Amino acid sequence: ENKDMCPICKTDRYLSPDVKFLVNPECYHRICESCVDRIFSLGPAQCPYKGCDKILRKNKFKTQIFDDVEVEKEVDIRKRVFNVFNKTIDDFNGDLVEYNKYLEEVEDIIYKLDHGIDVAKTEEKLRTYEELNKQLIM
């Protein structure tokens, strides 16, 4: 929103809002251009976005069309889950129920990764994503 776009310059619209407002994927915080240029030039620390402690990393930012914080994170989580599993047991033989059961397991693991669960099945899915990455190398 216009009332919150930067922890230092939240309402720069009266002072001509000519810069963008980057959002870090490990922070999900509205950080403007001018303040963040001082940030990653002097080391990778955390942002003080309402007293945040998540360490911001240098570069690897993104422009957003504002899908809140959930659907902005769920779109990259579904895109990261669609590349590791790829089209395994889906259209390899014109399968339908076996393709739907394999896509329901990919959707429920993505729903478990989106909700966070309790970092147990997600850590098991992190091993399964490591299993989906090791099976794509052999």
Add this chain to the structure above:
Amino acid sequence: YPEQYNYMCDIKKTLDVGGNSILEMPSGTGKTVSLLSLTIAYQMHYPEHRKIIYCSRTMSEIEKALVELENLMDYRTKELGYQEDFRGLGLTSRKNLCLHPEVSKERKGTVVDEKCRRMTNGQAKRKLEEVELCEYHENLYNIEVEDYLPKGVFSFEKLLKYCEEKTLCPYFIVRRMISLCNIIIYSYHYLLDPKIAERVSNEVSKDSIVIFDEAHNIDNVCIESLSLDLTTDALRRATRGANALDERISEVRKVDSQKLQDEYEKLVQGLXXXXXXXXXXXXXXXXXXXXXXXXXXXXXXXXXRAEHFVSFLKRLIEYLKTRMKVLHVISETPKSFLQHLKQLTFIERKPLRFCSERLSLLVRTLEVTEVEDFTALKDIATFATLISTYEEGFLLIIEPYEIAVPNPIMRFTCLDASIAIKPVFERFSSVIITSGTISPLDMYPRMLNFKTVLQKSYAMTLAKKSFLPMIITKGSDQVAISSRFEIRNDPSIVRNYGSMLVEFAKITPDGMVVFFPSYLYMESIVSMWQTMGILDEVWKHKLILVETPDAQETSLALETYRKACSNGRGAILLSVARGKVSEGIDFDHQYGRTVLMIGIPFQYTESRILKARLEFMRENYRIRENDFLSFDAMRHAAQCLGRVLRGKDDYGVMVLADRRFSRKRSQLPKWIAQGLSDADLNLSTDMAISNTKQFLRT
């Protein structure tokens, strides 16, 4: 009459041979001509063979077809003395054919079906686990109620008085009588309806004779069946609708989760076929004509549940807010828009099956579903069905930056109009296609390609009683081309044009109806007319139809126009030729004996809907910049021609301005060109010769 037997012999030869016939009828003389021939062709064959299916265009033609059928039964019970198997059903609207919202709700809107499904599921809740039913339920489906219609004619007004005296329900009688298959009278918005015609076609069970009544706006219903505007306020409804599903999934996963889990297994096994078969007497969902879509073997978000389906929908609506957040004028291909969607989110190619199952799921799951929230889901689901299939002929348009506040208006263009008229040829044979406001009728072999025969109106006699002149020179021949422009160029000429109307109405102050091609010309002179002598010494009171014409305002202006001519006063009916209420009732001196038309009817140009349909029909029939300015302008003028010809017993004078009317045709083409001041002395003779030649030709 012998002229009525000419079209009746053609109707007796085409109903037993042809499958579709374009029969032209004269105005005000072809109503009971095909009415008696339809019951005679059945009596010549078998009376339980092909029943009569009537397709009007307005509710008035539905009401006018019921009183003529009473005259057909009175002519069959007095000239024969035998009471056969009666028929006739008044399939009208839902707010008019009701009893419960006229007592407690006191609302005559489109929410009468919401109290209908609340009483249908309320009677279902009272007969399963437990409000209850209503005033008169669980009795209208009896066999004695099924025999109240082949024995006595109770349709619409006769049935609404029957459901109050016998204490019955008008909804469950008519719905149980489509399966009986009588003489069904309905309008054009039900045969091409993507929520009603899927239920009508499963109860008539085909094998009947479709009577197309006033089939001249058939191309307009196919455009009106689709094209919904998304004027950004539905995004606020979809945002609040998405948060309601988050609370509903939180309410379903808090206690009674077995009702959603067993429904998830029922969707993973029985899918949508068993879901539609099990669901009875409940609120049906929405689809893009299931008899025309044709799709089976679906999947529920790839074997997922409602918690994963609402995540795709929340993924869907933000992309819709992303695409609407654009610059100004931008066109969109429905196939390329689906490709840009898959670059954002892989929603496959079948969201048509991902929504109709979830719409039926949330009705069974959420019992206290909100009205504005669930309707916001149906607006997205109807758009999701149209982007999945039916891409041929489809087009997505965006309204430009129009202040920009009112700029985010998204619209989809309909496909071919021949696709909606396609399944009525294989379902029914001998489809009688009749219209009294067509001149010529060669565009119907052209546009909408179907093999049919062409028959014109073979009835033209007594030209001394049908005065058909036209005005050319308006004293200087300057206001005729002045009204031709869309913008009101030179309002001083329009004040001179409005000065001629006071002179024209003061000549014959005996019923005046003035049509208009636009409401801008009505609002231009009403600001400072400076001429009320006809509104104080001739017509006195004023009956002007506004652009926002209310149904009560149109009803009050119609009754007072009948009260003006029945008191020796006369009134001026300032209506819009492109506006609502096309009328059709006359055959008396209470109607306007002289009908005035301001120039020729025009169409709203420089619009994206017109420019899309221009290039669409340019590839189809190559009728660019011809039929769009002439065939459309004729039918809007032919609605004014259908009111003057009120039979051979009543006279009437219809004048036409400008000079572009000579390039087109008209019903009974006997037209003489004269000036405006010249026709004032001609109409004074025509209002005295017709009063002397009425007793001479008898």
